[PDB]
Design a protein around this ligand. Structure first.
Ligand SMILES: [Zn+2]
Ligand SMILES: [Zn+2]
Lengths: 9, 60
């Protein structure tokens, strides 16, 4: 699936 | 940029994915919104439903 991530706090 | 996505009604924090379901009300959801990390090795479903919605009426 097309994803956009930036880790989690 | 700040844009709302998941039913969370809040903006895309950072960790997100798009509904890979023929329907899926939207096509962008946050991990904090849903439940996952970097999305499983393959494809994730916008939401616990976004997936079930793709299965289309299933006992699962
Ligand atoms: Zn969905
Ligand atoms: Zn959300």
């Amino acid at each position: 699936a097309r994803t956009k991530q930036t880790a989690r706090k | 940029q700040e844009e709302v996505y998941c039913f969370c009604r809040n903006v895309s924090y950072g960790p997100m994915v798009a509904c890979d379901n023929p329907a899926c009300p939207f096509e962008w959801f946050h991990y904090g919104c849903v439940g996952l990390k970097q999305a499983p090795k393959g494809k994730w479903y916008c939401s616990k439903d976004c997936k079930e919605i793709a299965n289309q009426r299933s006992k699962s």
